[PDB]
Design a protein around this motif. Structure first.
Motif, short mmCIF file in Angstrom:
data_model
loop_
_atom_site.label_atom_id
_atom_site.label_comp_id
_atom_site.label_asym_id
_atom_site.label_seq_id
_atom_site.Cartn_x
_atom_site.Cartn_y
_atom_site.Cartn_z
N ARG A 103 0.82 -1.20 0.00
CA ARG A 103 0.00 0.00 0.00
C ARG A 103 0.86 1.26 0.00
O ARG A 103 0.55 2.24 -0.69
N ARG A 104 1.98 1.23 0.73
CA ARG A 104 2.97 2.29 0.79
C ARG A 104 3.63 2.60 -0.55
O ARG A 104 4.34 3.60 -0.65
N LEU A 105 3.42 1.78 -1.58
CA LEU A 105 3.98 2.08 -2.90
C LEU A 105 3.07 2.97 -3.75
O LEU A 105 3.53 3.52 -4.75
N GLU A 106 1.81 3.17 -3.38
CA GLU A 106 0.82 3.75 -4.28
C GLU A 106 0.49 5.18 -3.92
O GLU A 106 0.00 5.45 -2.81
N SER A 107 0.77 6.11 -4.84
CA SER A 107 0.20 7.44 -4.72
C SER A 107 -0.31 8.05 -6.03
O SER A 107 -1.28 8.83 -5.99
N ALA A 130 -4.40 4.23 4.14
CA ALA A 130 -3.44 4.44 3.05
C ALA A 130 -3.19 5.93 2.87
O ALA A 130 -2.03 6.38 2.73
N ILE A 174 -1.28 7.36 5.93
CA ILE A 174 0.11 6.93 5.77
C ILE A 174 0.85 7.89 4.85
O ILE A 174 1.93 8.40 5.20
N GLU A 175 0.28 8.18 3.68
CA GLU A 175 0.93 9.11 2.77
C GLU A 175 1.04 10.51 3.38
O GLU A 175 2.05 11.21 3.17
N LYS A 208 4.02 10.35 5.91
CA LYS A 208 5.22 10.45 5.08
C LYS A 208 5.51 11.90 4.72
O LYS A 208 6.64 12.37 4.85
#
Lengths: 141, 99, 147, 42, 49
Positions: A12-16, C64, C67-68, C71
Motif C-alpha cells: 500500500r505504501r507504494l501507491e500514490s 493508506a 500513511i501518505e 510520510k
C-alpha cells in the motif's frame, strides 16, 4: 507478528500516483468452494488447477479466496462500471509466475475495459489473515 | 420493624426531592412492569431477628408472623405494597457495609 | 431466559400473586413482525455484513491516505510502520465488533425493548422455537392449597 | 407528606389485561384526580 | 450514512414486494396494511441502528 497487515502496509505504501487502486478482503469461509457452478463461472481451469494443487502451500478454500479477493481488487483498480453484482470475474485471471508471485491476465470484457481506461498493465499484492484473504491491486493509468 | 419506617420515609422524601407526588405518575409513560426495586441491607429487621430467638424463648407476647419482618426483602416489599403496585423486577443485595 | 417480577398491592406478605405473567405481555399486531421469520433476519445479518466489509476496505484506504500524509510530514519510517500496524489491528478489531453487534441485534436480543414481542416468545425464537416447543414445566409446587 | 395507597390503579378484571398489554397506561381521572387504568385502556 | 442508504434500499425492496403482492392478486387493503406496517417496521429498524 508478520500479518498481511504488516506486509500489505508496505505494498500500500507504494501507491500514490499514475495509478488507480483496489482494496478488497474476503472471508475464507464466505467463499463457497463446494459449489462447482460458482467455481466454473468465476475461475479459469488454470486457476482451479492451481487452487486444488498441493503446491499452493494452502488449503483449497484459502487458495480460491485469495484469487477471488484479487479479482475483486483488480476490478476495483480498473475503476470501470460494474455490470452488477451477478457479473462473472472469470475474465480477470490470477496466476503465479516462476517466482510464485501473483500475475494478472485480462481477457474478454476486462481487457477491452482496461484498454479503454488507458491502463498500462495491472499488478497485485495478496496474502492472508487467519480468517480472510486480503488483496490490493494496482492499475497504472 | 423500625428500619422499615426509616426506608419508607427515605423513599417518600426521595420521591419529593424528585418532584413526584404520586408514583402512579410513571404509569402515564411506562408500563407497570418497568419499575424495579433493589433496596437492601446488611441484615433484616433487628427487632424481629432478636425477638424470634430470645423473647419467644422467654414466652412473651408476640404478633405471630414476626418471622417475615426479619427477612431483608420485607422492607422492599413494604415500599412496593403501600406506594407502588409495581409488577417489575425486585432484587435484594447484601454486603454488610457495602450494601 | 431469566426473570423476576413483583406482585401488585396485596396486604399479606405471604400471599402469592401473579407477576411472572408479565413475561407474556405484548400487542398481538395484525401481521407477525418480519423479525419472527429467522430467514428474514438471516437476510438482514447477511446483508449488513456486506456494508461492514465495504466499510473495512474504505477504512484501509483512509489509512493508506493517512500513511501518505504522515510520510509528507517527514515522520520516522518506524513511527509510520508502527502507527499503521496498530491502526490495522484496530480496524480489524472494529469490524469484528460490528459483526458481533449485528449478531447481538438480530440473533440474541432482537425482541428486547419491543412491545409487540413477549419476552418468553423472543427467548424461544432465538433458537427457532415457539411457545409450542416448551415441553416441560417444573412447578414451585409447595403442596399448599392456594399456591 | 406520606399518604399510602389502597386500591390498584386498575380493577380485578383489568388486572391480567394490564399485565398483558405493555402499552396499557393510566390517565388522570378528571373526577377524582386519581391515576387509573381507564376502562378502555386496551 | 450507511444506515440512511440502507433505509432507502429497504424501501425500494418494499416497493418491489408491493409490486409482487399486486401480481399475486392480493387485496388492496392487505397490501396497504402490509406496506404501512412494513414501513413503520423499517423506520423502527433504522432507529434501532
Amino acid at each position: 507478528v508478520s500479518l498481511e497487515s504488516v506486509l500489505s502496509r508496505e505494498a500500500r505504501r507504494l501507491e500514490s500516483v499514475n495509478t488507480r487502486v483496489g482494496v478488497d478482503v474476503e472471508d475464507i469461509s464466505a467463499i463457497n468452494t463446494d459449489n462447482d457452478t460458482f467455481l466454473d463461472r468465476n475461475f479459469t481451469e488454470a486457476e482451479q488447477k492451481y487452487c486444488l494443487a498441493s503446491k499452493s502451500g494452502r488449503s483449497p478454500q484459502k487458495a480460491f479466496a485469495g484469487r477471488w479477493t484479487a479479482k475483486e481488487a483488480v476490478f476495483k483498480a480498473l475503476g470501470v462500471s460494474s455490470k452488477g453484482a451477478g457479473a462473472a470475474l472469470k475474465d480477470i485471471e490470477i496466476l503465479v509466475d516462476e517466482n510464485g508471485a501473483p500475475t494478472v491476465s485480462l481477457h474478454g470484457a476486462a481487457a477491452e475495459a482496461a484498454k479503454k481506461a488507458g491502463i498500462k498493465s495491472v499488478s497485485v499484492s495478496i496474502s492472508y489473515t487467519d480468517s480472510q484473504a486480503a488483496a490490493i491491486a494496482t492499475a497504472q493509468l | 420493624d423500625p428500619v422499615c419506617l426509616f426506608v419508607l420515609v427515605s423513599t417518600v422524601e426521595a420521591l419529593l426531592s424528585s418532584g413526584i407526588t404520586d408514583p402512579y405518575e410513571f404509569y402515564k409513560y411506562v408500563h407497570v412492569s418497568e419499575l424495579g426495586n433493589c433496596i437492601g441491607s446488611g441484615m433484616g429487621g433487628a427487632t424481629a431477628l432478636r425477638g424470634m430467638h430470645r423473647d419467644r424463648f422467654l414466652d412473651k407476647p408476640l404478633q405471630n408472623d414476626i418471622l417475615q419482618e426479619s427477612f431483608i426483602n420485607t422492607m422492599s416489599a413494604w415500599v412496593n405494597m403501600l406506594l407502588l403496585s409495581s409488577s417489575g423486577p425486585i432484587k435484594t443485595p447484601v454486603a454488610a457495609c457495602a450494601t | 431466559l431469566t426473570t423476576t417480577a413483583s406482585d401488585k398491592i396485596g396486604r399479606s406478605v405471604p400471599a402469592p400473586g401473579q407477576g411472572v405473567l408479565t413475561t407474556a405481555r405484548e400487542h398481538r399486531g395484525k401481521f407477525p413482525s418480519p423479525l419472527l421469520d429467522i430467514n428474514y433476519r438471516r437476510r438482514q445479518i447477511e446483508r449488513r455484513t456486506k456494508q461492514v466489509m465495504e466499510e473495512k476496505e474504505a477504512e484501509f484506504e483512509y489509512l493508506a491516505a493517512e500513511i501518505e500524509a504522515l510520510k509528507a510530514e517527514g515522520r520516522p519510517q518506524s513511527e509510520i510502520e508502527e502507527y499503521a500496524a496498530h491502526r490495522a489491528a484496530h480496524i480489524e478489531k472494529t469490524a469484528e465488533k460490528q459483526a458481533k453487534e449485528i449478531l447481538r441485534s438480530f440473533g440474541n436480543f432482537f425482541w428486547k425493548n419491543d412491545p409487540t414481542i413477549a419476552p418468553l416468545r423472543g427467548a424461544l425464537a432465538v433458537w427457532g422455537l415457539t411457545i409450542d416447543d416448551l415441553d416441560v414445566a417444573s412447578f414451585h409446587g409447595t403442596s399448599t392449597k392456594a399456591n | 407528606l406520606f399518604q399510602a395507597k389502597e386500591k390498584a390503579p386498575y380493577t380485578d378484571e383489568q388486572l391480567s389485561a394490564v399485565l398483558l398489554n405493555p402499552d396499557a397506561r393510566v390517565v388522570e381521572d378528571k373526577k377524582t384526580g386519581q391515576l387509573i387504568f381507564p376502562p378502555n385502556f386496551m
